[PDB]
Design a protein around this ligand. Structure first.
Ligand code: CLA
Ligand code: CLA
Ligand code: CLA
Ligand code: CLA
Ligand code: CLA
Ligand code: CLA
Ligand code: CLA
Ligand code: CLA
Ligand code: PGT
Ligand code: PGT
Ligand code: SF4
Ligand code: SF4
Lengths: 31, 160, 95, 143, 153, 81, 742
């Protein structure tokens, strides 16, 4: 099984998207 | 006197110019879906997504890394769809950042003449959420329609 | 009032004083067809909920990207296929 | 007992042809300042937002975005044209706060009835070292 | 032979460097007639190079493996003229300059506007104090002994 | 949530700190610790921008008016937008 | 009304003001209290607007300073003519211009510097010059060193006359204010008497002296056997043998039979095959036509007689619906402000210098100028730098006008007010244009570098790849190549050889000019040029427009034109003055001109300059690698910087070693500038405190208290050393590379 083809897009594209989305939502909060 | 103050007000940070307040330009801007306040934001989002997803396919297909291969029609189009998946996502985050559930619309309630106007539902949580969903649906529909026109139905085109 | 000559400040009317206007917004009715509007309303309903749409977009994008990258043909990406060439020696003899 | 002069909304504005340096969204969601003066002669002055305007004879009202702009314009009027000026702060709720002369007398000259705020009865070098204010919210200069 | 260095007058590489310099100068010389001014300038340069190499050989300098003289500053008495004697001369001259400047600054210190005597130098006093730095070591030593060199503020 | 402007007792009474203020933060109040019978005060530090023009005109050995930069607002950041 | 208004003996000639430094202003004449005063004494020395508020004294000081500058220029010209007479090989260069390097400076035999006397040829050893004075003197008909000596003596006399005039027109007979404000008579005299009569006199010199001497030189006649220039004036038959129309005298001119003068007044175009320069008959006809045009263009403006034009009326007659009152009020602004005139003249002179450099590289007007690659490179680079500096100074003084001389209460202009009212729109649109140009010009280079580094050469923006062809510039070149066919039938050849065709001029085995090809690389470099120019314009125009006020500092004009900051308030107000905008735009002008001169050097080395074989083939200096290598930044780093720096790093031990030393020293000065650019005054002042304590311990501290340089002075020192190092680096690199191989 080719693991780089699964984890490299996950760590370079999907995880950064999730991380900056969550951080943008948390930063712009008004509690 | 061609350049006027902004709605007769010289102390507002703007000016009235033929590029700004022409009757034809005002008509064209008012008939755009983003400035159709009385219409459902779902429909305006659908129209905006259709136009943008339709125009996004061309650059990805013609300038992609696989533009000279057999997979030029599909993969680049997929990339365009991917961009829509990104773009709507950004819109969704905007809809969570700006508007709250319990607040009403923050759109202006007046016009240039100063008459009372119902505020646009777009500047609200539900309105922007509906707009974003319509944008996503229209974007994927427009990408699919562009792929169908260029490569599935094989309509004749210059393809740049 | 605000509309009189040479005066632009009204205490009871702030929105005109501060320029809170809809410059290009039009209150005209919907130009689209009613059947078109109904079809787009019922066919875009699941994407209305913004949190659910965000979660669905993230999961679908990640799953589709992983599925495409893992199951792409070997002749599409040059990285998916190997070198298909004999390796060359180093400038000191592989060291 | 000095009473603050009330704002007159019907005050005419100086003759200006429009500039991009005027009000912005901050005037709508937040406060904006309004300067009123009395010109004894119809003359021409320089706006703090760029460009030149023509003030009209009698009372004149001008809305700007910052207090610094209002004070700079008032200083120019006082130094060059010798005009008495007062500016206020207006909120989107309609509230008006009479700002500049807090007792009707200019702040540069002494006037009885003013209270001391931020007054420290020591020399500047007698401030307490930061180690003695650590783990407490009090700052050395606030003591 | 300090630090494995051959003397410059017994070094083959030093003579080799002189040979390359003279060969390049002769190659430049071959382009002109011998009675011309550029030829005379080139010949003078060659004679200067020969004198320089002979002087460097006879001075006692130690030449390295690359054919260039290497100075020794460790204090060896055979090579006191490379660093120690020029160092003493430099220290004397620098102390002269510093003592003259300090004396001029002290002399114009108690005036109505001393700064006017800094932008515009008062030449007679400066020329009077110029030769006071000839005996700068004695004056400095005595001033240090009397506690006048330093200021206790 | 404003810059902290402090007046010390070494103030001579010169009004230059007040005249140099572009946002009307300082004013002159009566006093008895100097010949001028007046001292500076900072009641409107909420409008202080931090330009430090006031302490650029103080003629004492060190500044009798001191502006310590602190938490910044829209009127403390000089934002017209 | 336009008379000579002059007051007698306004200023007493004495050395009292020499003995007092800083006499011109009040805050400085009190004497130095700190060291900063000294720097101030060299900062307000020529700021006559701050010394006095009277325009008359300012104008008189300006006039006499101009006279002193003219005296310095004449002294420099006398020096060049003297160093071309003595210590030069001009007579040797005249016989063999294609093999003897020009030289006009020799070093003395001290400390081994005589190695700089290189074998330039012609039995001479000295420093090879690149100013192209030899080509000027050959084009002027100078064939002897006595003529150069006479010219040097005359220029010395003229420098003395200029100095005497500068003393006379300030200390003895000074013009009044109304004399300077007579702009109409000044324009008439400077268009008809300075430019028109000067062009007419130079055309007369070219017709009567330069043409026969250069004909004899190009005929192979030995220079010492050529008849003297006065012999062709006294003997009309001697000039008539070369040009038979001279047998007819001036009667064809007076009878309008000008076509009889078609032997020495020709519209030929192209270049001279014998010399590689423009035809001197073409230059004679050009200067004659220019003289006629300027002379009839100098009788336009009104004076004591009612005929003529009024500048005020002409300006007031042009007003449109968009601009309102129009150009009314500009005459009073321009006639009462020296800074506005300085801005306008500096911008125009910088643009003129830039177009001069382009037209000299494109059309060499002197014999054996194109084949002298060092002269061409030096002239182009030098005049590019001069033009950029003058263009920056234009905005630098426009800002001074806006801060000081601008007021709307009196001398109000509608156009300037409308510009200042929508300045945010201008700045934002120019900001967007700069961002768009930067992306679509430099991201293409980044894309090419990444595609080449990833092993994807088919994805780059190359000629063998995605092509960005300059169709408009190629169409212009094609149109100008066929101009003699249809559009300009009176011209034998095209205006230059840099458009197209089969034409090629080669002198002495070296290529003079070739049809320059335009491709994707030229496209990318030209859009990079546009981006850099637009950014410099953005910085300078933003400084000019916001020199008075903005949304941050509404009273910036009260702070002055040249002030450091407004404190750390509003988040920080650092470098808000227009002087700091000039200081920032200096770097961007440096960057733009550096890219321009790099483009010029590489393009002419790869596609124009080279050598011609006897068979007919052409081999260029760099082998035409600009088309494939210049599209990537790595190509510029390797094939242009690294490859061509081998001629400046290996110059040690030869006559070009001074260029290597200047290379290293310029790198050192450029690095030294970063200390002033990156630091701040407070740290240096605190260190100076400890050094002052060390000096005070030994009773050696000075009365002038040492102070660190001011914020503005620190920025000025940083930018000055930065420009000096980064310009001298290119100077040494260019000179060594183009002298060693060209
Ligand atoms: C700045 C300019 C720039 C430009 C123009 C290009 C251009 C190109 N690159 Mg390169 N690239 C750049 C910088 C640039 N690059 C940089 C900085 C890097 C990082 C090192 C790369 C690295 C890179 C990679 C890794 C790849 C490319 C590739 C490509 C292609 C794009 C493929 C695509 O998916 O995008 C298309 C995207 C679009 C949505 C285009 C949007 C533009 C629209 C059409 C604007 C039109 C404006 C409109 C007229 C305005 C008014 C509207 C009107 C209604 C008023 C294209 C040939 C691909 C390839 O190899 O092919 C050659 C690829 O794999 N590039
Ligand atoms: C702590 C430092 C560390 C670093 C710097 C890297 C670095 C790298 N890893 Mg490794 N890796 C690590 C620890 C680390 N790894 C651990 C603890 C594991 C679990 C055994 C793995 C298992 C792993 C896999 C399965 C893959 C990589 C891959 C990669 C590359 C892409 C990043 C990635 O996909 O993350 C993925 C990270 C994890 C699954 C968990 C990290 C905690 C990158 C060179 C990819 C590859 O080999 O491409 C060349 C890939 O497919 N890594
Ligand atoms: C670190 C992770 C990363 C990864 C995995 C990739 C991956 C890739 N790069 Mg690159 N890229 C990166 C970083 C990364 N990039 C960065 C930082 C830059 C900026 C310098 C670029 C700039 C760049 C350009 C300019 C281009 C690429 C393109 C390419 C593609 C190479 C050839 C090919 O597969 O075409 C085949 C392509 C496809 C079939 C696309 C598949 C995408 C799926 C189907 C879309 C649906 C999901 C999508 C990933 C988004 C949603 C996920 C999440 C946001 C919710 C591939 C998708 C090319 C491209 O994708 O255009 C076609 C291209 O033109 N990249
Ligand atoms: C534009 C400015 C200019 C410049 C940069 C130079 C540059 C040079 N000149 Mg030239 N020169 C000029 C104008 C200029 N000259 C003019 C106008 C004349 C006509 C008189 C000459 C005539 C001339 C002669 C006759 C000589 C030079 C020499 C030199 C060299 C310097 C030697 C020297 O002066 O040190 C000595 C410097 C001193 C400070 C000594 C005191 C001289 C006083 C103070 C100078 C002013 C007095 C009048 C140097 C290459 C020398 C040369 O190249 O010989 C190989 C040399 O002999 N020049
Ligand atoms: C037709 C005659 C005439 C001529 C030739 C000039 C030429 C010149 N003037 Mg102008 N000027 C004129 C009429 C004339 N002016 C009039 C009538 C006025 C008043 C309205 C002015 C007002 C004026 C001002 C205020 C200034 C000039 C300046 C200059 C110089 C700048 C150009 C330059 O340096 O190029 C280089 C040009 C030459 C060296 C070529 C030779 C010209 C010779 C040397 C000049 C002799 C011309 C003179 C007017 C006549 C002699 C008077 C007699 C009593 C001796 C240049 C010498 C500027 C300057 O540099 O002043 C020093 C300057 O500040 N002019
Ligand atoms: C936008 C259009 C425009 C443009 C492009 C220019 C461009 C030019 N003008 Mg200006 N000018 C304009 C409008 C314009 N002007 C208007 C409306 C007026 C009327 C007020 C003038 C008045 C004017 C005069 C009177 C002169 C110019 C000259 C020139 C040229 C300067 C030569 C130089 O570079 O120095 C190179 C060296 C020199 C030849 C110039 C010497 C220095 C001059 C004499 C000083 C300028 C003094 C000026 C009268 C200021 C006095 C202030 C007074 C009120 C106290 C420059 C190309 C000069 C010219 O004609 O040159 C041929 C010139 O004599 N201009
Ligand atoms: C064409 C002629 C010209 C003229 C007459 C003026 C006139 C003037 N300028 Mg302007 N200026 C010009 C061109 C011109 N400028 C250009 C081309 C630029 C762009 C660089 C500027 C940028 C500029 C600035 C930034 C400022 C002025 C200001 C001034 C005024 C005072 C000048 C001063 O006091 O310096 C007196 C002389 C010096 C300080 C000499 C400094 C040394 C220079 C920088 C070094 C040159 C290096 C040299 C080649 C290297 C040799 C090595 C060395 C060892 C010898 C005066 C009105 C000043 C102003 O008005 O202040 C309010 C000011 O702030 N100018
Ligand atoms: C050498 C590097 C450098 C760079 C890259 C920049 C960059 C820039 N400068 Mg700065 N600047 C520099 C040095 C540099 N400067 C220096 C030394 C000084 C001192 C004088 C200044 C002072 C200065 C001034 C005074 C001004 C600028 C301006 C500009 C901007 C205009 C260009 C533009 O926007 O085009 C587009 C952007 C660029 C060319 C930058 C590189 C981007 C590449 C092409 C693409 C990167 C790929 C893409 C983003 C993918 C990202 C990957 C992802 C993982 C994040 C830009 C941000 C001007 C500006 O503000 O105008 C708008 C301006 O007025 N600069
Ligand atoms: C090398 C070792 C150097 C040791 C120096 C430390 C000794 C104390 C230094 C004090 C000083 O510099 O001054 C003394 C003088 O200096 C010395 O004695 C040291 C001389 C050092 C040079 C000679 C050292 C030996 C060199 C051998 C070679 C005494 O002066 P005072 O403090 O009594 O002066 C008071 C004044 O009259 C006002 O009241
Ligand atoms: C985009 C830039 C727009 C600039 C508009 C400037 C403007 O107001 O328009 C003038 C010019 O209108 C244009 O044609 C603008 C041209 C825009 C492009 C500029 C670059 C040159 C190509 C109006 O000229 P007018 O005839 O009303 O009066 C001019 C003057 O006062 C004499 O009467
Ligand atoms: S705070 Fe400063 S300006 Fe104000 S009275 Fe004290 S010393 Fe004078
Ligand atoms: S760091 Fe220097 S330039 Fe910046 S605000 Fe402070 S004093 Fe002014």
């Amino acid at each position: 099984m080719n693991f780089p083809s699964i984890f490299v897009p996950l760590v370079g594209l999907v995880f950064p998207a999730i991380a900056m989305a969550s951080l943008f939502l948390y930063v712009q909060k008004n509690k | 006197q061609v350049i006027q103050p902004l709605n007769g007000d010289p102390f507002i940070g703007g000016l009235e110019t033929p590029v700004t307040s022409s009757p034809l330009i005002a008509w064209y801007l008012s008939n755009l879906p983003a400035y159709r306040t009385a219409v459902n934001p779902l429909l305006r989002g659908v129209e905006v997504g259709l136009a943008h997803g339709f125009l996004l396919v061309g650059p990805f297909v013609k300038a992609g890394p696989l533009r000279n291969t057999e997979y030029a029609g599909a993969a680049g189009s997929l990339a365009a769809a991917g961009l829509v998946v990104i773009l709507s996502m950004c819109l969704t985050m905007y809809g969570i950042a700006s508007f709250k559930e319990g607040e009403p619309s923050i759109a202006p309630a007046l016009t240039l003449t100063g008459r009372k106007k119902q505020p646009d539902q777009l500047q609200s949580a539900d309105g922007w959420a509906k707009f974003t969903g319509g944008f996503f649906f229209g974007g994927v529909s427009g990408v699919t329609w562009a792929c169908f026109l260029m490569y599935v139905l094989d309509l004749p085109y210059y393809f740049k | 009032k605000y509309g009189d000559k040479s005066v632009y400040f009204d205490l009871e009317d702030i929105a005109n004083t501060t320029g809170q206007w809809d410059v290009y917004g039009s209150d005209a009715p919907s130009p689209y067809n009613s059947l078109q509007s109904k079809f787009f309303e019922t066919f875009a309903a699941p994407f209305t909920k913004r949190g659910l749409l965000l979660k669905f977009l993230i999961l679908g994008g990640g799953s589709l990207l992983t599925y495409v990258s893992a199951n792409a043909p070997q002749d599409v990406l040059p990285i998916t296929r190997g070198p298909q060439q004999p390796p060359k020696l180093g400038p000191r003899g592989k060291i | 007992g000095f009473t603050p002069p009330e704002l007159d909304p019907n005050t005419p504005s100086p003759i200006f042809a429009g500039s991009t340096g005027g009000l912005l969204r901050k005037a709508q969601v937040e406060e904006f300042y309004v300067i009123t003066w009395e010109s004894p002669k119809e003359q021409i002055f320089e706006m703090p937002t760029g460009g030149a305007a023509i003030m009209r004879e009698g009372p004149n009202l001008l809305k700007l975005a910052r207090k610094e702009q209002c004070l700079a314009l008032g200083t120019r009027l006082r130094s060059k044209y010798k005009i008495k000026y007062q500016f206020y702060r207006v909120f989107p709720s309609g509230e008006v706060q009479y700002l500049h002369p807090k007792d009707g007398v200019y702040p540069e000259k002494v006037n009885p009835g003013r209270q001391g705020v931020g007054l420290n009865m020591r020399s500047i070098g007698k401030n307490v070292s930061p180690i003695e204010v650590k783990f407490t919210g009090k700052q050395p200069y606030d003591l | 032979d300090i630090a494995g260095l051959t003397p410059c007058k017994e070094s083959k590489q030093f003579a080799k460097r002189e040979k390359q310099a003279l060969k390049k100068l002769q190659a430049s010389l071959k382009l002109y007639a011998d009675d011309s001014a550029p030829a005379l300038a080139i010949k003078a340069t060659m004679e200067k190079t020969k004198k320089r190499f002979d002087n460097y050989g006879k001075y006692g300098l130690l030449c390295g493996s690359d054919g260039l003289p290497h100075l020794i500053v460790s204090g060896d008495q055979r090579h006191w003229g490379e660093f120690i004697t020029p160092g003493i001369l430099f220290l004397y001259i620098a102390g002269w300059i510093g003592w003259v400047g300090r004396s001029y600054l002290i002399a114009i210190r108690d005036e109505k506007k001393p700064t006017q005597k800094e932008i515009i130098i008062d030449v007679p006093l400066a020329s009077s104090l110029l030769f006071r730095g000839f005996s700068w070591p004695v004056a400095a030593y005595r001033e240090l002994l009397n506690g006048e060199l330093v200021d206790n503020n | 949530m404003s810059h902290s402007v402090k007046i010390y007792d070494t103030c001579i009474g010169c009004t230059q700190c007040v005249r140099a203020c572009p946002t009307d933060v300082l004013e002159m109040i009566p006093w008895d610790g100097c010949k001028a019978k007046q001292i500076a005060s900072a009641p409107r530090t909420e409008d202080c921008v931090g330009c430090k023009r006031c302490e650029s005109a103080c003629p004492t050995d060190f500044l009798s008016v001191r502006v310590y930069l602190w938490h910044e607002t829209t009127r403390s950041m000089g934002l017209g937008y | 009304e336009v008379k000579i208004l002059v007051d007698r003996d306004p200023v007493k000639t004495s050395f009292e003001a020499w003995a007092k430094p800083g006499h011109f202003s009040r805050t400085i004449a009190k004497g130095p209290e700190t060291t900063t005063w000294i720097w101030n004494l060299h900062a307000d020395a020529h700021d006559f607007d701050s010394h006095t508020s009277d325009l008359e004294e300012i104008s008189r000081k300006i006039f006499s300073a101009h006279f002193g500058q003219l005296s310095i220029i004449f002294l420099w010209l006398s020096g060049m003519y003297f160093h071309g007479a003595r210590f030069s090989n001009y007579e040797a260069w005249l016989s063999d211009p294609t093999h003897i390097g020009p030289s006009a400076q020799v070093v003395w035999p001290i400390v081994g510097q005589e190695i700089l006397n290189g074998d330039v040829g012609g039995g001479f050893r000295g420093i090879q010059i690149t100013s192209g004075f030899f080509q000027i003197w050959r084009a002027s008909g100078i064939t002897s060193e006595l003529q150069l000596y006479c010219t040097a003596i005359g220029a010395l006399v003229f420098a003395a006359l200029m100095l005497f005039a500068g003393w006379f027109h300030y200390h003895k007979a000074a013009p009044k204010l109304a004399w300077f404000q007579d702009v109409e008579s000044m324009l008439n005299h400077h268009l008809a008497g300075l430019l028109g009569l000067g062009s007419l006199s130079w055309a007369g010199h070219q017709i009567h002296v330069s043409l026969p001497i250069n004909q004899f030189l190009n005929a192979g006649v030995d220079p010492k056997e050529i008849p003297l220039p006065h012999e062709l004036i006294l003997n009309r038959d001697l000039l008539a043998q070369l040009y038979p129309s001279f047998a007819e005298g001036a009667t064809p001119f007076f009878t309008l039979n000008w076509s009889k003068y078609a032997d020495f007044l020709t519209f030929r175009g192209g270049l001279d095959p014998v010399t590689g320069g423009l035809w001197l008959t073409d230059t004679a006809h050009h200067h004659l036509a220019i003289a006629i045009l300027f002379l009839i263009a100098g009788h336009m403006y009104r004076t004591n007689w009612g005929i003529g034009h009024g500048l005020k009326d002409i300006l007031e007659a042009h007003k449109g619906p968009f601009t309102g009152q129009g150009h009314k009020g500009l005459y009073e602004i321009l006639t009462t402000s020296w800074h506005a005139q300085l801005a306008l003249n500096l911008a125009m002179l910088g643009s003129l210098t830039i177009v001069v450099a382009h037209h000299m590289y494109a059309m060499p007007p002197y014999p054996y100028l194109a084949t002298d690659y060092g002269t061409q490179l030096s002239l182009f680079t030098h005049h590019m730098w001069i033009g950029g500096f003058l263009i920056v100074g234009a905005a630098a003084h426009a800002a001074i006008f806006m801060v000081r001389d601008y007021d709307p209460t009196t001398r109000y202009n509608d156009l300037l007010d409308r510009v200042l009212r929508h300045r945010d729109a201008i700045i934002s649109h120019l900001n967007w244009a700069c961002i768009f140009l930067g992306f679509h010009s430099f991201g293409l280079y980044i894309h090419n570098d990444t595609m080449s580094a990833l092993g994807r050469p088919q994805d780059m923006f190359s000629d063998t790849a995605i092509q960005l062809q300059p169709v408009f510039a190629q169409w212009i070149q094609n149109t100008h190549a066929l101009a003699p066919s249809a559009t300009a039938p009176g011209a034998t050849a095209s205006t230059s050889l840099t458009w197209g065709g089969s034409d090629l001029v080669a002198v002495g085995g070296k290529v003079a000019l070739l049809p320059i090809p335009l491709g994707t690389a030229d496209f990318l470099v030209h859009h990079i040029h546009a981006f850099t120019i637009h950014v410099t314009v953005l910085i300078l125009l933003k400084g000019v427009l916001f020199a008075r006020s903005s949304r941050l500092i509404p009273d910036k004009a009260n702070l002055g034109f040249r002030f450091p900051c407004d404190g750390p308030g509003r988040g920080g107000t650092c470098q808000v003055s227009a002087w700091d905008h000039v200081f920032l735009g200096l770097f961007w002008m440096y960057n733009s001109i550096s890219v321009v001169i790099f483009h010029f050097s590489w393009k002419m080395q790869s596609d124009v300059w080279g050598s011609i074989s006897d068979q007919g083939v052409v081999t260029h200096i760099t082998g035409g690698n600009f088309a494939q290598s210049s599209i990537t930044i790595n190509g510029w780093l390797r094939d242009f910087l690294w490859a061509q720096a081998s001629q400046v790093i290996q110059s040690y031990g030869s006559s070009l070693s001074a260029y290597g030393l200047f290379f290293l020293g310029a790198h050192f000065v450029w690095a030294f500038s970063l200390m002033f650019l990156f630091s701040g005054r407070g740290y240096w002042q605190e260190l100076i405190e400890s050094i002052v304590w060390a000096h005070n311990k030994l009773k050696v501290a000075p009365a002038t208290q040492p102070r660190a340089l001011s914020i503005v002075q620190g920025r000025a020192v940083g930018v000055t050393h930065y420009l000096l190092g980064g310009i001298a680096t290119t100077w040494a690199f260019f000179l060594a590379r183009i002298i060693a191989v060209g």
